[PDB]
């Protein structure tokens, strides 16, 4: 009836999707088999005698990460044809994922998406997970988006991009992949949320006090954000928000759809014991610049629009009291042309904790998605790094020899230059 | 039911046939005493194809041993599995045709042929209704090539509608026993083209190549060479003796192989063939097996199949195996090796699955292929024949015993046209 | 009372019949001896003390296929003179099966058929099982159909042909055998269904995920189609149809009675766990072109008439909703002069599973038998391959010397040429 389709492309998309689907199964109480011992209808189908199968597709060109899902604990939760694998990796090349090897797998991907989308009309939208710095997450991610745009025009397309960090890279050619992806996700994505790796690293180091987390601890935190985003579709609330109403409330002009994230509280079991988790204080911690999930300080930006999703035993009077304090605070500033810069949502169902995970059971939480003009700096840093790389034509022979022509570098650079000037003109 | 009468002619035919009865009796579980052992129903359900009940429980082969010299047939009797044959089925000769085709066919063979015709009629007519004959002989010698092919002519006239399959070893290409090879070979082929229904070619030099390069045997005797030919001879009659998913008799193979009646000369191959060392290292599966089957190094004729086109080929698989891999690999070879198959015959390959593999192996195949690469041997032995005939060398050991000059010219004409007809479909 | 007589000719006929009669015995709950510990009366005869003998004849010239039935588990199921054997094989020769070794077996076969048909007059018709590419399946198939046409003139005669595949043949003389058989199947059978071997190969590869199927797993799938076809005759249903009304509903013109097959769902224990098997979805999979069981893509043809046999927990309102969805879908083409392109049929009894087989327990299933103009390709490809072979008279001397006259090839070819023009003229 009302559902959303999840697309996971690349290694980062799959492993974040693995943590996302573990949380979704546990919160709705279905086992790894898929049988529980109409709230689940937005994420799970019905298959015969009480079995539920997720509405997701797993796409990678390299088989190693999808084989290990297919042989793990969750073998029979997923449909065997929803896990699509290639033969050879894109190997950190946008050109490989887009032109050379990418086209052989997109046909199989569109067949699965069409069969999953035709079950009911009033399909709410598509949630895409990808890594911008990778090969197949960037290349094949773009290629899927042209074909989705031509077929399913009016349907909303939300993207959760694992953006490259300011300092940490784990790739050398990723400034090339990032600028090429950002050009092509301007015209193919309705709402893009930036998730940065070092932002989750330092959030886990100060808040949860874990000195050595890994990628699986990053993915639990990402899963909590997505669960809080789509909580209003799944459960009843006092003031619910739909996914089509995010783009109405957070996108002022078509080219500005790059938003941050924040989640609060993320506190461990030893710290939750001592905190009164009031609605006023969890919303203060949400707007704190050190608790943001993109590593982009909003103090040198102006907030254009902000969306607050409260979840748990939150009364609407404490929301109004808390958001008034934020508006009056002077270190956080709003843009002049947007006087009412808030969208509030309250949901009843408290956040579910995974056993053996590192978050604590909390009675209420906030997820914040905010559009700001601070995104000028995150494009400016790659604009510096891309210009350094391209000035004496390094690593270009890998792209040019593989099937893309020289000049898509130039077109992508000027499009990013146009985006920088657009953010500057809005903030005046 | 259906019955094959076996005839073994010449020294080569007797020694290759002696090992054939060794391999068939072991496959059906017959003791050299003639008793059955092995308590399995599938072994005994189709035994009348090659054996006869003797009202004492024992099984005697339907085999006729024929030679003009008493020496080598005594050796077959004295050996193991030699007491299996009926003593009346041995027909001796006393004097012997000394490597003379003329004396094997015209003079010395003539006073014996009435006696061998008596014994073959006694065994043939004695059952319900016969299926065919099988004859094993050599086309280099005197009694195997001369009086062996005389029997072929006589039994075709008696039984015109029954199939007649012949396992003939040809003269070797490079180095030769029995210096009058091309005289014996050419004289035998021109009336084996008109009297034999399917003819399967073996070369000794191809067998030596197999035993050197694949089996890696240091000292291959005639015992080991005959064992290889016997393995392929058992594979062609797998379907008669055991059940199968896709059954195919000898006449089923004949209709599927020979497009035109003049050309019925086949190449035989066997797989798998591994050394003792490499037995434990090798993959036994259908795709590997078809790759060893379509190799020049595995064919039992020393004529390279890549120089011609397979007109049609057939593969009799044996063992518990899946029929899609039996189908898809035969499609795979026609797509990959497009140039080695003829174009105006679609789906040139024939497949057959017999469910009982040979002893010790899980899976085996015998390959019978009708190729136009067999014209390389017919050209070669024609040139050797024409070299000697122009100068009339060794001719008066044929001319002297009543074979005139015109039949040699007819033999060359009847075999040069066979070379030309293979070129016509090349 | 009312019964049907099964005839199995050739090796393929016998082994398919072996799978068919194993399913029929288990569905009616009779033991291999033939005694159960009047719905079954359409396939089995009463023979004294609760004992049931099948109404079938097994005809082959080779003893090597019938003897294993005589010595197998089902020795005493069959009456010993229902299993008729010759002495020598037809050896892939139509001329052998039709002229030479034909007359010695057909006289004995007609004696058994007459004794089996005179028990309870009012019998429904004849089922014939044969391989078209073989010798005795094609040759004796003609001769027995000629003799049945002269004796039982007003009778329904259904033929299930294992038609040769486009690429895989496992014989060389099959362009000769197929064109000669279709000449004698045109004037002498009433309804013919084409089954292809590599169609069932690829169905078992994608739907059951068996990469190495044998002849036994093809024959189980064929047995399920025939059981679902004759389920209405055996059991009570909401809307039943017998075999006589197939001709009224599927054959628009006397020469056009070539039919395809599809069966859905064919799912293993891995897939039945995760699918709902709703009536809407199993009928969508029935019309899917890769689930057809003849290797003849119906995208480039027009459906002349279609007959759907639902079996199981199927309500008639979901049938009407599901067929309406098919009509509105644009990827299928129906012919303009057949508006009422569907016959529906509902049976109550769910399809039975053989223990230790490869199917799973399904609650509802569909068997589809369709007449389409896509069959022009399956006869034109065989028309081409006969042209190549007969171009310079390959393999002809085995036929012509052995009893048939040169010219019957030419007469059969012009009949097939007439059939090609007939399919082209109807589709306009």
Curated annotation (Swiss-Prot), chains A, C:
It is found in: Cytoplasm, Cytoskeleton. It comes from Toxoplasma gondii. Tubulin is the major constituent of microtubules, a cylinder consisting of laterally associated linear protofilaments composed of alpha- and beta-tubulin heterodimers. Microtubules grow by the addition of GTP-tubulin dimers to the microtubule end, where a stabilizing cap forms. Below the cap, tubulin dimers are in GDP-bound state, owing to GTPase activity of alpha-tubulin. Belongs to the tubulin family. InterPro entries: Alpha_tubulin, Tub_FtsZ_C, Tubulin, Tubulin/FtsZ-like_C, Tubulin/FtsZ_2-layer-sand-dom, Tubulin/FtsZ_GTPase_sf, Tubulin_C, Tubulin_CS. Its cofactor is Mg(2+). GO terms for biological process: microtubule-based process. Undergoes a tyrosination/detyrosination cycle, the cyclic removal and re-addition of a C-terminal tyrosine residue by the enzymes tubulin tyrosine carboxypeptidase (TTCP) and tubulin tyrosine ligase (TTL), respectively. This modification has a role in multiple cellular functions, ranging from cell motility, cell cycle progression or cell differentiation to intracellular trafficking and signaling. It catalyses: GTP + H2O = GDP + phosphate + H(+). GO terms for molecular function: GTP binding; hydrolase activity; metal ion binding; structural constituent of cytoskeleton. This is Tubulin alpha chain. Mg(2+) binds at residue 62. Its main location: cytoplasm. Keywords: Acetylation, Cytoplasm, Cytoskeleton, GTP-binding, Hydrolase, Magnesium, Metal-binding, Microtubule, Nucleotide-binding. PROSITE patterns: TUBULIN. The lineage of its organism: Eukaryota, Sar, Alveolata, Apicomplexa, Conoidasida. Coiled coil: none annotated. Dimer of alpha and beta chains. A typical microtubule is a hollow water-filled tube with an outer diameter of 25 nm and an inner diameter of 15 nM. Alpha-beta heterodimers associate head-to-tail to form protofilaments running lengthwise along the microtubule wall with the beta-tubulin subunit facing the microtubule plus end conferring a structural polarity. Microtubules usually have 13 protofilaments but different protofilament numbers can be found in some organisms and specialized cells. Its EC number is 3.6.5.-. The active site is at 245. GTP binds at residues 11, 62, 135-136, 170, 197, 219.
